Amino acid sequence: QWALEDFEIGRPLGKGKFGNVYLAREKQSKFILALKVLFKAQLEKAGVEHQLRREVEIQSHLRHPNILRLYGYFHDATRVYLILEYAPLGTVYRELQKLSKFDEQRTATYITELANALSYCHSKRVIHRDIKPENLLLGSAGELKIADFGTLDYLPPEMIEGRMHDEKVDLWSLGVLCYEFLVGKPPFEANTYQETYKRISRVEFTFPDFVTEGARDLISRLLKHNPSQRPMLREVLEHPWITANSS
Amino acid sequence: QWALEDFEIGRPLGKGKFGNVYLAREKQSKFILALKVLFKAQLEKAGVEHQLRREVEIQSHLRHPNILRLYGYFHDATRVYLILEYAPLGTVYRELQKLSKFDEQRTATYITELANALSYCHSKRVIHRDIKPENLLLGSAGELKIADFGTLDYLPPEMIEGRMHDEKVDLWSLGVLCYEFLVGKPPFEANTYQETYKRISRVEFTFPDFVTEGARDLISRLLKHNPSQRPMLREVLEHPWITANSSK
Amino acid sequence: SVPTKLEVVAATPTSLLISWDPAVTVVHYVITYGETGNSPVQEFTVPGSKSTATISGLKPGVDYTITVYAIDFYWGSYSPISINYRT
Amino acid sequence: SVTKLLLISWDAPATVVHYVITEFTVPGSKSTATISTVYAIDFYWGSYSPIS
Ligand SMILES: Nc1ncnc2c1ncn2[C@@H]1O[C@H](COP(=O)(O)OP(=O)(O)CP(=O)(O)O)[C@@H](O)[C@H]1O
Numbered sequence: 001q002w003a004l005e006d007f008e009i010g011r012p013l014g015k016g017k018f019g020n021v022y023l024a025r026e027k028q029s030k031f032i033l034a035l036k037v038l039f040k041a042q043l044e045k046a047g048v049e050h051q052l053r054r055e056v057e058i059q060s061h062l063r064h065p066n067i068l069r070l071y072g073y074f075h076d077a078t079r080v081y082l083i084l085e086y087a088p089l090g091t092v093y094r095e096l097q098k099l100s101k102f103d104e105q106r107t108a109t110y111i112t113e114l115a116n117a118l119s120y121c122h123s124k125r126v127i128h129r130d131i132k133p134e135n136l137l138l139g140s141a142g143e144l145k146i147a148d149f150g151t152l153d154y155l156p157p158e159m160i161e162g163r164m165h166d167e168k169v170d171l172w173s174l175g176v177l178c179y180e181f182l183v184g185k186p187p188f189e190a191n192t193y194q195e196t197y198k199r200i201s202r203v204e205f206t207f208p209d210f211v212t213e214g215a216r217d218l219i220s221r222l223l224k225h226n227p228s229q230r231p232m233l234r235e236v237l238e239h240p241w242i243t244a245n246s247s
Numbered sequence: 248q249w250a251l252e253d254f255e256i257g258r259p260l261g262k263g264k265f266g267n268v269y270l271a272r273e274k275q276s277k278f279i280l281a282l283k284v285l286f287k288a289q290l291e292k293a294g295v296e297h298q299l300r301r302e303v304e305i306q307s308h309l310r311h312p313n314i315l316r317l318y319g320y321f322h323d324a325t326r327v328y329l330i331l332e333y334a335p336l337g338t339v340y341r342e343l344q345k346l347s348k349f350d351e352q353r354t355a356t357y358i359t360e361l362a363n364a365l366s367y368c369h370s371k372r373v374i375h376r377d378i379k380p381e382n383l384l385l386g387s388a389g390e391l392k393i394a395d396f397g398t399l400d401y402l403p404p405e406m407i408e409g410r411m412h413d414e415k416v417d418l419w420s421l422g423v424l425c426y427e428f429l430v431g432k433p434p435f436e437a438n439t440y441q442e443t444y445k446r447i448s449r450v451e452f453t454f455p456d457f458v459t460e461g462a463r464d465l466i467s468r469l470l471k472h473n474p475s476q477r478p479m480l481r482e483v484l485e486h487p488w489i490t491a492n493s494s495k
Numbered sequence: 496s497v498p499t500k501l502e503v504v505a506a507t508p509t510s511l512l513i514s515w516d517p518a519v520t521v522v523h524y525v526i527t528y529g530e531t532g533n534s535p536v537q538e539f540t541v542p543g544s545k546s547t548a549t550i551s552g553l554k555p556g557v558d559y560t561i562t563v564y565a566i567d568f569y570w571g572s573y574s575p576i577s578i579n580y581r582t
Numbered sequence: 583s584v585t586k587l588l589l590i591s592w593d594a595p596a597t598v599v600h601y602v603i604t605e606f607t608v609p610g611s612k613s614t615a616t617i618s619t620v621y622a623i624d625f626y627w628g629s630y631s632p633i634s
């Protein structure tokens with residue numbers, strides 16, 4: 001039974017539209033934590049209060065070193081508080097903006113940590129994990145941490161068209177992430193929402209010259225329209241380009 | 248392809264969460280249409296602009312007599328406009344509240360109309376459409392019109408638990424509406440989230456004393472935890488209770 | 496803490512009429528009432544669409560304690576707010 | 583019709599992804615167009631009404 005008085009606030013780590021989050025420390029134990037605040041009014045106008053409460057219970061049955069922990073929650077008259085694990089090194093999105101692209105060693109390591117967490121999620125019957133760069137947090141040792149609490153460029157055609165989908169969705173997003181890490185932008189990015197929508201349905205993307213032959217093979221196997229033709233998560237971890245560059 | 252000067256905006260037909268829907272008569276063909284005037288500032292503040300724009304793309308390709316048509320859209324510097332098919336008799340939620348419950352032949356006809364629309368959606372592999380009574384409009388001849396743009400009572404157990412799902416989720420929502428049409432409330436309505444989560448996951452619902460055996464047999468077959476045990480859409484149309492009260 | 500306000504409106508030799516202020520939809524309010532300081536506290540609920548309730552069956556010359564707390568549909572109950580009224 | 587109508591400026595508040603000119607294309611961050619009918623392009627809802 002947590003409350004606001006049990007935490008000592010710190011500097012704000014971020015401030016978006018739906019909410020914000022500060023550094024927090026439990027007063028009794030002085031343990032460093034993160035307190036994400038969400039407004040009930042904003043989540044009620046967009047219908048996210050349904051899926052926010054659903055993901056709060058979902059992520060309590062999941063334990064993985066590459067998935068951000070949720071230790072509890074509490075609320076008041078106008079805000080919703082989530083006690084999260086502190087990620088000191090920020091987001092992959094912000095880090096991608098500062099360096100444009102990642103090397104093959106860091107990219108393959110990110111894919112391995114992502115595929116491992118998704119394999120644990122699929123084993124626990126968890127389906128869709130939004131692995132946007134904004135939702136990928138970095139631990140103290142630089143390890144990736146999924147924090148699922150815009151998204152157009154990362155969803156397969158079966159999701160943007162309102163069709164059925166399964167665990168093969170994460171395989172498409174891995175290929176989009178692997179492309180963005182090495183190139184610097186999502187493969188289907190365009191100026192119009194209509195153009196980016198059609199480019200996803202047609203799988204309209206090209207490889208730049210500097211992309212190695214091993215990276216092109218992995219991305220081409222993942223970015224497939226038919227979900228049944230995409231590989232399985234353990235096939236990604238056994239890929240020669242992954243095992244040669246990951247850690 | 249469209250602009251504000253192509254229509255003659257008339258009286259409002261009801262306020263929306265982000266704007267207002269008005270009666271619009273085109274300037275050229277003089278066709279009566281529905282114009283949803285959604286404000287950008289509230290679509291950008293709530294974070295639903297991409298959600299509506301995505302559903303606009305999906306709805307623009309589904310042409311069925313029981314689905315409200317999206318003919319096109321346009322926008323200004325601070326509002327978004329949507330050319331919708333005119334539904335004169337309002338929404339089912341309003342008439343479900345004007346009365347308490349529906350007929351047996353009105354419920355079966357509505358279920359038959361819904362099962363036909365979802366058969367057209369499943370043929371294009373398009374699954375999971377918000378068919379709640381608030382999203383159900385009435386045509387000129389009382390026909391059901393599916394419109395798209397709390398909501399936990401209509402979700403199957405595989406969705407509230409956070410698992411993968413197929414086309415059987417619309418078979419679950421079909422049984423929830425059939426119960427609400429005959430009773431007046433969803434079969435898993437509760438006063439809390441955990442109480443609603445427990446009622447849906449464990450399939451805890453009861454039929455009142457005025458529910459026909461043929462009606463409760465169809466609802467019991469559709470409201471099953473295992474999605475593979477849910478019937479086919481053609482089995483719902485070929486149901487004895489459906490074929491004895493429908494008008495298709 | 497919501498309900499941020501509370502008061503006894505009408506009152507009666509063996510009855511009470513309480514009222515409260517929320518800017519957020521609530522499922523219902525859990526109303527419980529007991530004498531300050533010795534007996535099990537009686538409990539009852541009032542729908543979240545109502546802003547007042549009636550407590551009857553009390554006893555004159557007794558200082559009661561009326562605590563009210565709302566319940567969020569998704570996040571549970573709020574912090575209670577206490578009040579005193581001597582019959 | 584997105585408003586203000588060879589160096590031609592617009593000063594359109596809007597935002598705008600880019601401006602195509604009847605064919606060239608200027609970035610949306612710029613409020614002028616140096617040429618040597620304008621369509622304002624929004625990201626989600628596409629082009630605005632032309633002018634003009
Ligand atoms: N455990 C955590 N540890 C460290 N930082 C965290 C964190 N959780 C969230 N953040 C920080 O705040 C940001 C994530 O929260 P945020 O509210 O911004 O995302 P969001 O999903 O709500 C959409 P938006 O980014 O537009 O606000 C991150 O950029 C991060 O810096």
Ligand SMILES: Nc1ncnc2c1ncn2[C@@H]1O[C@H](COP(=O)(O)OP(=O)(O)CP(=O)(O)O)[C@@H](O)[C@H]1O
Binds near residue numbers: 260263332381384396
């Ligand atoms: N084609 C259409 N034809 C006739 N009336 C329509 C209509 N579309 C919407 N409306 C009417 O005007 C109102 C507009 O509300 P809107 O379409 O935004 O639904 P919503 O998703 O916001 C939930 P609610 O309707 O309860 O506000 C509706 O309540 C309806 O009565």
